[PDB]
Amino acid sequence: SGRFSIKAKNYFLTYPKCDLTKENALSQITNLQTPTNKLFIKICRELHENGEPHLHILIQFEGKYNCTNQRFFDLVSPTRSAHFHPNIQGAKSSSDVKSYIDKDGDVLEWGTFQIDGR
């Protein structure tokens, strides 16, 4: 009696124990089309204490993007015949995104972020 439908301006992709690189995810994500428009793209890598390689991503579209399908963010290994299903999360409102975006260091940056308001 319910369907998985995500609606937000910003989205966060999390790849658990994913050996996927930011470049591949960046190219794939960047190449990933949307019903809206991609503005800024922040890709930061993080290692889990479980010894598993984790990957964090933060994208923000010009308009509220509807991610009611976990097939769009379906990233696969261009080096291995393995597919990875990242966790799609809708980031509500908050500058916390800017804070994290500013938290650069050994990360990839694409597009230009813009805070709505005055």
Q: Which CATH number is 32's domain given?
A: 3.40.1310.20
Distance from C-alpha of 60 to C-alpha of 89, rounded to nearest angstrom: 12
Residue 83 annotated in ligand binding: no
The structural domain count of the chain equals 1
Residue 54 annotated in ligand binding: yes
Distance from C-alpha of 17 to C-alpha of 70, rounded to nearest angstrom: 18
Determine whether 49 is exposed, middle or buried from the number of CB atoms within 10 Å of its CB (0-12, 13-18, 19+): exposed
Candidate list 11, 15, 65, 100, residue with the active-site label: 100
Distance from C-alpha of 42 to C-alpha of 21, rounded to nearest angstrom: 13
Residue 104 annotated in ligand binding: yes
Rg (the chain; Cα; Å): 14
Method for structure elucidation:
NMR
* 65 annotated active-site: no
Expressed as residue numbers, the domain containing 63 is 1-118
